[PDB]
Amino acid sequence: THDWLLVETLGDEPAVVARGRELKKLVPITTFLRRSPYLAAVRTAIAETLQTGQSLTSITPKHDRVIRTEPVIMTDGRMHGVQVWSGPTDAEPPDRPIPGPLKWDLTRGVATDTPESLTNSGKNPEVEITYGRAFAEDLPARELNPNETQVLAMAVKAKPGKTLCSIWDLTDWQGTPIRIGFVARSALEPGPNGRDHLVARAMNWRAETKAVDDLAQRILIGLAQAGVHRALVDLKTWTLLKWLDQPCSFYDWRRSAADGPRLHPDDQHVIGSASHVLRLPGHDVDWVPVHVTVNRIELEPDTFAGLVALRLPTDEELADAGLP
Template sequence: MVHDWLLVETLGDEPVVVAQGRRTVNLVPISALLRRNPHLMAIQTAIGETVRAGQGLSSITPKNDRVIRTEVVQMTDGRIHGVHLWIGPPDMEPTERPVPGPLVWDLDRGTATGTPESLLNSGRAPDAEAGPIRTFADDLPTRDLNPSEARVLRMAITREAGAVLCSTWDVTDHSGEPATVGFVIRVVREPQDDGSERLLCRAMNWRSEPDPAATPPDDLAQRILDGLAQPGVQRALIDVPRWTLLKWLDPPPAYFDWRAGMAGDRAVHPEDSGEIDRMAAEFETGTTSGVLRMASDDGWTPVQVTVNRIDVGDGVFAGLAMLRRA
């Protein structure tokens, strides 16, 4: 067995491996990956004890021939997303550990919560800080839509508890260098103290390696999006019924507060709620447009919004919103 760190996601019914070293692994149950390993039971026990204790541990196998070391991947709210595990001879030092970053998307509010580790892995500068309101778009690069992002957007739109995805995408980091980011994301429904429930995407990311077997994607959809680009117009993908921003295709505008207006409390003028309902109904069968007053430093800024239907796969439609100052 190669003595790499194994990243194990622990939010499902069975722990699944999502990375071996920096290489992304597609949700392989730990019992299947290590089925011939004589220390499988001790490894499973170490994972369970790490999750229960909420902290890493070091243990030795019954025959004293292997050391098992674990580190916990814990979100800021205390929920454990995964366990990093290394097993090797007692006289061997563990290899360098690629630090995973936990993060959460709140599907009910349309907001994102990151950690310093997840921001760094996604290509942000080491001193980057998460603002008071972050959107899904803050976690997806402003650029062309790639197949992995399309799959994530489908999960955010369909909102099916239990759905899980493990993949990679390529980004340009804060220094202009290309990087591959691995990620795993799972939709979970969690009870709250007040008796309500929240629908969340709990995730981890890490710096991964490019997949040499990956085939170039069909760029027909991207050519269509490129054909809709216009000077003075910002394009974004949105979940229309919930008026939630998913991803910017162009640099976002500065003339309104898009984080407040398209996430969280969705700060659109109260008198425009009926206009949003009308647009959502029209979107079910085709294109819709309207003028919405969005929160800005000057109070309310009218924004002309035109929304076209775009299939992001499996018959799931996002809204391609084209925004310009009215």
């Protein structure tokens, strides 16, 4: 019981998601600490941390114990969780695993990370942008993880209430295999025009090193094609969700994730497979013609996403599209 407990506090009852770095499945603190004499006091420490937004040091003289709490606060000021440690008074707590708050605005189709969430996921914070991120910048390219279907489902057909806890395999920027835990929860939050946004709020952390059978993934990899870049997209909004191959440099998908037109307004009407040439935002010019091939993927019953294959259009293809 000497470890730091990571508690997600966006539900009705605070719920444990990490003991040290080991994942726990959103276990309500009263269940996780059912047989604990410090349960009542722990609940109070967390409750006050939510109130004050402050790191607290609480003492219970009766049991000669101290409770220490660390808020996990997103850069919009929102409390995503609280990290808690208890034990004897003059005892020194263990090194604290750094939790990384992030959020996905599903209405905007845009992610906001933190230096902490980026570092945990093994990216180089000195060279990373925290805001205006495409969802496909937070998900790995090509590699698949447990319950990734539910993440994508969470994103395309937004319904509040849905929560997810998982451990994922990643590779950091130095090439090293790593693992992360995370918790994520979707909810409706008030937006600018009196219209509510659907937003998924999350925390990750670097997990312990512990590291397969996937015929479909081997087949999918075999379908890769030079010059062609596959991705999952939100059909309704053209929000980019995930790269299945490496990202394409044909167009500026990163800048246009949060800023400007996602496609040419004249091609808006254009958006069994379907194929067409679409003008997407350029790096140096306004518009770049890209040949797009689209299939509907069913993630959950009545929940669909777009499988898009992107490549440069031929001179011939440009002509048929009515483009010079």
